[PDB]
Structures are given as C-alpha cells and as structure tokens.
Amino acid sequence: PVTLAKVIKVLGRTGSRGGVTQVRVEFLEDTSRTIVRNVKGPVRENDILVLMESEREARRLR
Amino acid sequence: REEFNPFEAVGKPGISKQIGEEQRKRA
Amino acid sequence: RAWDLIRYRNFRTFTGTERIQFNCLAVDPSGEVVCAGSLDNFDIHVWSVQTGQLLDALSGHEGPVSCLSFSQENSVLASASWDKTIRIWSIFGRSQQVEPIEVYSDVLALSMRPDGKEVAVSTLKGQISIFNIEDAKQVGNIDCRKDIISGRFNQDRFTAKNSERSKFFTTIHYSFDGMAIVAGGNNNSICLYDVPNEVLLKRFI
Amino acid sequence: LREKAKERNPDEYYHAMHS
Amino acid sequence: GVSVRDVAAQDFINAYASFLQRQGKLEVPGYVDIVKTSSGNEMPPQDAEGWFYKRAASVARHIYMRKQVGVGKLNKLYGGAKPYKHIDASGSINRKVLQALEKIGIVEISPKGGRRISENGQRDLDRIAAQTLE
Amino acid sequence: YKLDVLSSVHFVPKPAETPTISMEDAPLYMSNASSLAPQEI
Amino acid sequence: KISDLENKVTVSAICRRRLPVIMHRLKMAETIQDAVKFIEQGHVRVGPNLINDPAYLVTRNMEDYVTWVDNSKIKKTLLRYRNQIDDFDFS
Amino acid sequence: MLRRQARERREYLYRKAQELQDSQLQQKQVDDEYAATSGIMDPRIIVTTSRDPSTRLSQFAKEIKLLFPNAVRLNRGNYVMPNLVDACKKSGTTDLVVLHEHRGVPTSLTISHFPHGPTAQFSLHNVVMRHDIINAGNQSEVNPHLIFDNFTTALGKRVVCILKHLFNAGPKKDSERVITFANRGDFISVRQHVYVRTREGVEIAEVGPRFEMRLFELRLGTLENKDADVEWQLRRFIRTANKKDYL
Amino acid sequence: FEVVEEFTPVVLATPIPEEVQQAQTEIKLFNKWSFEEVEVKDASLVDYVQVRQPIFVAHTAGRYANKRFRKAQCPIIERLTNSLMMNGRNNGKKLKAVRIIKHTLDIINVLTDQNPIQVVVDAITNTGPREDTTRVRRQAVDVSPLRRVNQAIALLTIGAREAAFRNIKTIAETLAEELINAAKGSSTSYAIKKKDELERVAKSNR
Amino acid sequence: AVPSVQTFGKKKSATAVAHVKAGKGLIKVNGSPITLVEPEILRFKVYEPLLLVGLDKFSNIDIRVRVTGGGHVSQVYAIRQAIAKGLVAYHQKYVDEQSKNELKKAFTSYDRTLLIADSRRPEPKKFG
Amino acid sequence: FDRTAKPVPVITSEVTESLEDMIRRRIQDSNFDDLQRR
RNA sequence: GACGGAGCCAGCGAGACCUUGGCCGAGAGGUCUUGGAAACUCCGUCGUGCUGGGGAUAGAGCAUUGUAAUUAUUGCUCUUCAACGAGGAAUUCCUAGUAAGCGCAAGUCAUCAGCUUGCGUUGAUUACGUCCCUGCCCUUUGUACACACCG
C-alpha cells in the first residue's frame, strides 16, 4: 500500500543537494501525522506526494 | 614573465604570428 | 516620507536622484520596501525602509505609472500605467520575474484582493476588469459607462449625454469581504458594484 | 522621406479626409 | 449560384479532370508519357493515363480565379525548388494545355495577351462545380 | 497660483499686540519627553 | 540659468503653450480658430481629462498625451479615410 | 508614446548642436548624454550578436560580458532591430553591444547608448579569445581599474567617454583587476590584466582577450536609427588615409 | 419543465456540415473524443493532468513557459503533441505531431473501444514513478507530481520514437501500442519497464 | 444605408479585415466559405467563434473576411480574432449592449485572444 | 605599388614588452583613468 | 521519410539592362513583341532490403557565355552508382517566439563573394529552485531618524 501526504510547507535554508528540496507533508489518511521528506522535482505547498514508505524520516543529503 | 603569459596555461597553436614576422626583420 | 504614528515624527524621508515627481505609492506588507510611481519617468522607484537608499528601479513601462499596490499576503506588486498594460512584479526572491497583462485602454486605478489572488482595474473606457494574478488571465469585467452620472458644466457648449469628460472611475477599492467594489471618479456619482456576479448594488450622489 | 515616414503621427486630421 | 471557388480545389480538379477524360475531346501531345513536367523532377507522372487531363483541369481553374494568365505564369506557378534554384515548370506542357483547352472552348486568347475564361468555359467550370456539390 | 490655474485642468483655490491661539497642533495629550527614543536621550 | 530668465521669458512663450497653439503645431487642427472650436465642442482630451477651455495651456510632461476623445466624430473621419476605423475601439 | 521620442530626439539634436557651438567658442566636461547619469547610476549593458550566430561568436559574446561587470546576454534569434531597441529601453538598459563575425572570427563591434544615442561602431582584428587558452581558469569579476592611452584629440576624449561609462564607479583602490585601452595609430589595443604589488615593483598577468579596436562610424542616435545624423565617419578612400591619425 | 433558446430553424447562407452543429452542442477533441467522462484515476496526478477544458484541436498558441507552473494548466494533449516533435528534423512541425496524435487516437479507439483520452490519462498515471534516486552512490527520494507527468510524457514519446525508429511500424501505431500497454500496466511498455527499474533502484538504495 | 461595421485582427504580420452587415447568414473569408479554410486540421479554429455563441447570431447577418500577410496559422488566428471582434461590435452598434456583454463574456471565458491581440513583445527575463 | 590603407599592426614581442612595461609604470604610480563616484 | 500529383501563405529591400504576353524545345535554352519562397496541406506509389536514402567518380550528347581559340565557362538529358546505417577518448553552447527547421533580399567607406548582414515563416522539451560541489565577490565601528531585532 502507498500513502498520500499533502505538502504543507517547503523548508528553506536546508542546504540539501542540488535539485533536492526538503519539505513537510501531512498524511491525507490522518491530517495530524506530519513527516519531513526529500523530493527531487519542483514542489509547492498544497501538493500531494505519494509516500510508499511512511516510516523513514528524512535526513539531510548534503 | 614568460610563464603567466599564454598568448606569447598555454594557448592553442596559431594564435601568434611572432615566428613569421621575425623572419622578415631578418629578411 | 515615512511617519511613526505613535510618536508622530517623520523618522525618514525618501527621494530620487533627480527629484522625480511621485503620484502613487505602495508599501510591502513586511514594511521593509516602499515603491512609488511617477508620471514623468515611466519607472517605479524602489527603496529600503530601514536604510533609506534606492534598492533599484523597476523598468518596463512605456507609459506613466498610474497606480501601485502590494498584495497583502503574497507580497506581489501590481503596477498599472497609461501604456495599456499591467505588470506583475515578483521582486522578492533570488530571481525576479515580470508578467505583463495588456489591457484594452488606459488604466487609471487598481485594487488588490485581500486574498492577493485577484486584481481589478478601472480603465478609461469605463470598465472594471478583474484579472487572476497567478494565471494572469481575465476572470471578470463590469460596464461603468451607463451607470456613471455626469452633469453638464455651465460652460459646456455640448450636451452631457454627448459629453465624454468623465465616464470613468479614477479610484476603486475592494470590500474586505471581497465581493464588492466601490468606484469613484471626476463625476457626481459613487457606484458600489458586486464582483462575483458583476452588477451595480447601489449608486450615491 | 524615410524620417518623414518614420515620424508620421498616425492620428493626423485634415478636412479633405472626408472625401 | 454555384461557382468554382465554392468547391474544394482538389475535388473540382479531380472531377473536371475525369470529365475531360470521359469527354475525349482534349488534345494530348504524344510525348506526355515521356516528360517529367519540370527539370527539377526526376521521374514522370505516375498517373500516365490522366495526368495531362488533370493538368488541364488545374490550369482551367487557374484561368478562372485570375482573368488573365500566360505560359510564364503557369511555369512559375507550377515551379518548385531543386544551393536551390527554383526551376519553373516545363514550358512545353503548359502551352499544349492552354492550346488544348481553347480547342474545346474552355479558354480563349485574352486581350493584351494571355488567356481568358471564355463565357462558355466559365459556364463549363460552373456545371462541374455544381456536379461535385450535388 | 497664477500659472497653476493657467496650467490646472482642475480647480485651484487661491492661497491665503495680542497673544495668539495656535489652532492646528502638529497630540495635545502627548508629552514631548515621551516622543524621544531611549537612544536619543 | 537665472541670467537667461530675464530674457528667455516672453509673452510669446506663454502663448505657444496654449492648448489651441499646441493643437496647431501638432497639425491636429488647421487653424487656431478651428482649434478653439474643437476645444469648445469637447472633441479634444489631454490625458484622462477633457478640456473645454481654449485658454488651457499644456505643460511639458503632458503634451505627448493631447488627442481627441475616443468617441469624437472627428476621430471617425480620421480612420475612415485611412480605412483603419476599428469599430471595436468605438473610434 | 511615439510623440515623446520624436520630441526628445529634436531636443537631443538641439543640445548637441548647442554643445558643439559652445566647444567651438571655447576652442576659439562629461558629455551631455552621459552627464545626467555620470557617477550616479551604475551602467546596465546588454550584450547580443547577429542573427544565427556561430558558436565562436556566442563564446566571444560571453567573453565581452566578463570584461564588463554589468553585462547581460540575450540571444538574437529572429529579434527585429526596432523591436530590440524598444525592449532594451523598456528594461532600462543603458548600453547595447552587438557583435559581428565571419566564419567564427569576430569582425565588428558596435556600441549604442540609450535612450537617444550615441552609437559607435568598431572593427575587430587580431582577436585572441580566452577559450583558446588551455587551463586558463575563471576570471575575477571585481570592478576593474581603467587605463586610457594616447587619446589626445577631441575625438580622442569622445571615444574614451563612450568606453569609460561601460564600467561601474568607485573601484576599490586595491581592486586587483585592470583593463587598459591603448590607442596606437587609431588601433586601440584592449587587454585585461591581474597583478600583484611586489616589494620592488609590480607584476601583472594577462587574462585576455586581445583585440585591436578601430572606430570607423559615430552617429547621434540609436544604432537602429540608420537616419541618425553622423557625428563622425571614417574616410578610407582619402589619399592621406595611408598616414592619418585621429585618436 | 423545458427551456428553449431558439424560436426559428437556423439556416446559414453558407452551408455548414451537420457534424459542426453537433460540435456546437458539445466541444470534442477533433470533434470525435469527449472530455466529459475522462477523470484521472490517481489523486496525485490531479491538478497536473489538465483535461477539464475541452478543445477541438491540440494547437493553442498559449503562453505556458512564462512562470514555473503554467505547464500544469496546459491540456495534456498539447503536452503530448509538443513532446512528440524532437530529433531536430521534426522540430517546429507541430502540425505533423497533431496529425500523428489524431491517427494514434483513431488506432486506440479501433483496438480498444474505451475512449482514447481515457487510455492516454491512464497511461500517464500508471507510468509516473513514485520514488527515484539522486547521486550522493545513490539515495532514494520521492517524486513531485509535475516531474511525474513530465517523465510520463517524455518516456511514452521517446519509447514510441525508438520503437519505430528503424522499424516497419509507423510512429502513430507504435505510439498507440505504447499508450495502451502503459494503460494496461503490462511490462511490454517501455515506460513501465523504466518506471519499475527506477523504483527498484530506489528500493535498493533506501 | 444597410447597417454594416468593420473590424481588424492582427497576428504577427497576418492582418484580416472583417465586414459584418445585416444579412441571411453568409460567412466568407476572401470570398470563399469558411468551410474551405486551409489548413483543414486547424480549420476548427476559424469556427471556434462560430461554435461558441451559436449560428443564429450569424443567421441574422453576413460576414466577409479578407486576410493578407504572415503564415498559415497567423492568418487563421487573425480570421477568428477579427470575426469575434466583428460580432461584438455589430451587436454593440445595432443590437443591445447585453448581447454584446454575454458575447464578450463567452469569448473571454473561453479564450481572450479571440478578442484582444496576442503580441509577444520581447522581455529581457534576466533583469537588465 | 602604393597601398590605400594602413597596414594592420602586428603584435610582436617588443610591441608587447613596451606595452606591459608602461602598464607596470602606471600601476606603480597608481595612475588609473577610472571613473569615480560623483 | 523518398517520389507523383493538386493546394497554397510573407517581410526586408530601388545609381543598354529588365521585363507582361505570343510562338518554338523534353529540358537547358531560343525567337517575336508590350511597359519600366521554402518549409508546409490533401490525395496517391514505395517500403526495412545500403531499398524508390546518398549523388562522389566516370561515359555519351543537347545548349549559353565570352573569344578567335577547335580554348575553357556555365546549365539540361540519359546511363554508371561509390563513402555514409547516428559517430570513441574528450569537448562547446543554451531558458520564450528562446533552441531548432525553413526560405528570401542587399552587398550601402571597416570585414565579407555561396561569405556577411538584414528580412520574413514554423516552432518546442526542461528549469525558472539552491548555495549542498566549483568559481567570483561583500561584511565582521547597526551607525541605521521611529517600532522591532542585535550586541
């Protein structure tokens, strides 16, 4: 199963690797649970990402 | 003075015409 | 000039290099950037509130800048000019983008949505045209020519109905709820319109 | 003539223009 | 009220080309099967049987749109690209086509040079135009 | 005034012992000391 | 400079700024009297505002924008001859 | 809008005529187009090329940038010349640089100053560009020091003022980059150096490019305006063209 | 209850084909495919696969490169047509792409009775990978919906391109096979193979 | 005289002149039916006004379009844009301003380029 | 035969040597023709 | 995509020779008179075969231009039918009418002779975010007129 999480906020000054953005997303199934994730493409707030794994916590990738 | 001047890092062949002209101050 | 209304003092004054005549002014929601427009320079001067210097000059208009406004939320600047177009400036950020939207006739007034998602403009033809800021496409338009009341001046040698002196609105503003526009100009009428459905709610003498 | 063509104000009036 | 220009160009030319073939009165030169219609061309027209009749049909329609036409106009009108040269179409075929049409009476010698759409030919192109529509 | 009314599309009005009442006050309740910053003092 | 101002200023300088005199130099009207008639009849706009006073004088930032009102019958004859009369602009 | 430029052109031509008369009377400061913004607003330069530029010209256009601190590059793909100037004036650009090549060899360079001129045209010879230097490295983009040599005639100061305002004002006294324009028989040698102040002298270092510039046309107007009155023109068919110096 | 807007039979002096009035009733792609029933199956692809605004033919002459996300508002069919022209020789020939796409939808309808636009949107949804990798070795990250639709378009078009690159099959029919196989989710489609490969490599480097 | 009105539509160098008068539903471009416009694939664009507002508003008028300059697509855009302008202006001059208002609303809601010129003036995206 | 225009100069070493020699002289004296804030 | 038919749309440009038109030839090209664009659209043939892609070399002819030679020069017809099947190590450039494809016109003091410029036509993908790597810089007397933040 794959979960869906809506981006609430694009984090700035995270210094992630070029082309990688650190964002915060709240799961659609439960609005409360919020997870920090790394994305490769263009992103904005209110955008929903498909999280196939919901347990991993995003770490800075240099 | 000879080192940091690539025009006279090194330039590609053919940028300078010094060898040609000096032949003619001889000629 | 910037004024502190707790102590009532002019704590700073701003001016151009060549004493440009200013007719409109706009202020960033953060209160850190102030932009003014002129009828003679065609350029929008940008300053920094804290330091008092000229950050930069926003060029791009081929006509005088008639009005300015900062979006309250998104902080975008929308500028209007007699050059028959409206320009949307994303001054804040690493890269600066400008999105021009051309307009039918000369724009005289501009009002910005408290949401910051829409902008309405009053033009010389007597039209209040409402554009979507993000998509830069028209979403609404209201006729104002007929509703406006203009009286024949005593010296007019031509009739009021045939007169074309002022059937436009030189000033417009939104209602904070966002469903109405109050419009005014060099005339004997204030007209209150409804944006979503495009009618006259009521007119005042 | 080219300068003369370049700076033609497009809006010029005369009375002969009626015919 | 039907006219040539009311009908699609290809539909009119294809239809009128067939009628010239069925009519059998349009003179065709013997060398049609051995010519390419242009120096820029490399092999002769594939539809050997009726390309000349289609050639006449297009030319007759061209006479209709423009009152006066000459061989030079048809040559550059039918020319094509080859550094490019833009060689004009073969002059030989166009003259025979223009001569062939006026034998039937479709066209006739213009004043001040060229060919006109003869009134009989102009009415002719109108009957075919109505036929395609109907 | 004169060239302004010549050059004005729009109406331009003409510009205009005993102790004196100063009628326009640039607040009457504010104190001058309260108008100075802690840095200025 | 001020030194010039005691001699540059003239009555002729003020009159050339008069709207009908501006009207003529632009070739907008053939004669000054013709310009006065058009101004009075209300067929001439300067920027957003219409002027019915012939004695109005134009400033240097402003002369670029003197023109006929959008719905002037004069502005129709303009574009009618040149065959550029666009109804959609109502002119 | 068209009326404004038409009027200002007449004012500009009148100003130069009055300035020319004043100079002639003096014969018996900074130039007027630049006097308004001389040392007040930093210059804005837009660098472009001719239609369908070769790869080398694009590289050369890229290099003319790094010479000028405030240069921006614009692809001239199908841009129409009145359309180009109007957009550049609209964006507030002060100077426009257009480059010409022949088989990937730069041939001419023209500089046009906005909003009403002047326009100066140069011919390019002995162009030695930096991509031709192996392992050369990147430039320093600080505000450079400027040197002008053998500009003696009135035309000499005139060309200097055009080239002078292409750069920013107030270079740091220890600014480590220097650009020199050396006039030698009307052939202005242009070069870029980076140095080190040594205990017993100074040592410089070539960054490039090398290119010898000769003015041949100078008009009072934008480079688009081919009707612009010619302030000065180069005469090549003169019999004394063999030995005439102007700069 | 009834509301009627016409009292008189409409007859135009210029004849117009009956199909054109049937189009006046509703806007349909090429007048043959309707967008009323098309909906994006996956919620994530919604707001980026734009199909709500009906268009008769792909060409629009719109401005979508101005800001960073006008491309989402673009009709997906326009995106297919624009992506289809590539390889230099085909650059700038949008009309060729429009015709190729018309033949492709005709082929899709012929093989499968489902609406071809539904097949296209299903393929775009299925072939959008959900995780990918970035060079540090490789590290796994998630994929933005816009970047998903961009890959989907690119992979489908390029697969159709090399499939008929030196093969008897023409561009239209190979594109139709590509789209239908992608919509089915079968591994036969090139784009599904690379989608699965990218997701598997992301799985390895998680 | 017969109520008639004239509009222009511009796209790149293509310029189209549309004359709209009272009539019986006769639409021509260069004096040919709008059904014969070329390219055929793009042809629906010339009908795109024709399809949005209904053909009765045409059944009560005739329209004649003459187009010159530019390339094929530019003529197509000029034709549709000029037609739409002609409809709105005719409905202004000889019909109520409401029918004009719904008409403008329809075009602007669908595609604003149908009524206003699309001129892609150059902009230096890089500041300066 | 006579020539009509200048022979285009050739950048020989002594032309270079004379040229950077002065550039060292200008910078030694800090003599720059550079525009300054006004 | 190659080829045959048919349909057609521009903007720059003016120091006897050009010409609209008629008559010859398959073409090139001739003769007798008047005035001073492609790409691209439709319908068709062919077909994964170094094939109807590629036209280098070669042979035989039909003409033009000069000049006085059996001299070359520029085109047309047929036949002959090569390398080339997407390109290594490396490398250069590029963000909207932009890359790219397409044709046209003028040689207007520098440079250019199928080279230069200008003109018009069709027309995109992706990014429009970051200092994570690289490189180039600025600051480390708030000095800055309120509020706020800082020390």
PDB file of C-alpha atoms (C1' of nucleotides) in Angstrom, chain I residues 82-94 96 161, chain L residues 1 39-40 86 99-102 122-125:
ATOM      1  CA  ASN I  82       4.723  19.270 -28.139  1.00  0.00           C
ATOM      2  CA  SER I  83       6.809  16.416 -26.724  1.00  0.00           C
ATOM      3  CA  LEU I  84       6.318  14.356 -29.891  1.00  0.00           C
ATOM      4  CA  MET I  85       8.327  16.732 -32.124  1.00  0.00           C
ATOM      5  CA  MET I  86      12.028  16.203 -31.379  1.00  0.00           C
ATOM      6  CA  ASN I  87      15.188  14.766 -33.031  1.00  0.00           C
ATOM      7  CA  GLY I  88      15.819  18.119 -34.732  1.00  0.00           C
ATOM      8  CA  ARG I  89      14.420  17.183 -38.137  1.00  0.00           C
ATOM      9  CA  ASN I  90      10.913  17.297 -36.623  1.00  0.00           C
ATOM     10  CA  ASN I  91      11.491  20.453 -34.551  1.00  0.00           C
ATOM     11  CA  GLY I  92       8.862  23.117 -35.187  1.00  0.00           C
ATOM     12  CA  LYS I  93       6.472  20.818 -37.098  1.00  0.00           C
ATOM     13  CA  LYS I  94       3.592  20.876 -34.621  1.00  0.00           C
ATOM     14  CA  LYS I  96       2.767  16.841 -38.039  1.00  0.00           C
ATOM     15  CA  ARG I 161      10.066   7.104 -31.104  1.00  0.00           C
TER      16      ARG I 161
ATOM     17  C1'   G L   1      10.710   9.692 -44.800  1.00  0.00           C
ATOM     18  C1'   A L  39       9.294  24.564 -45.096  1.00  0.00           C
ATOM     19  C1'   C L  40       4.103  23.458 -45.316  1.00  0.00           C
ATOM     20  C1'   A L  86      23.798   8.103 -35.843  1.00  0.00           C
ATOM     21  C1'   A L  99      16.892  26.046 -29.087  1.00  0.00           C
ATOM     22  C1'   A L 100      15.911  24.377 -33.578  1.00  0.00           C
ATOM     23  C1'   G L 101      13.921  23.846 -39.143  1.00  0.00           C
ATOM     24  C1'   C L 102      12.762  26.954 -43.457  1.00  0.00           C
ATOM     25  C1'   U L 122       7.026  27.139 -38.480  1.00  0.00           C
ATOM     26  C1'   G L 123       8.234  26.487 -33.691  1.00  0.00           C
ATOM     27  C1'   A L 124       9.269  23.268 -28.845  1.00  0.00           C
ATOM     28  C1'   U L 125      11.290  19.939 -24.028  1.00  0.00           C
TER      29        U L 125
END
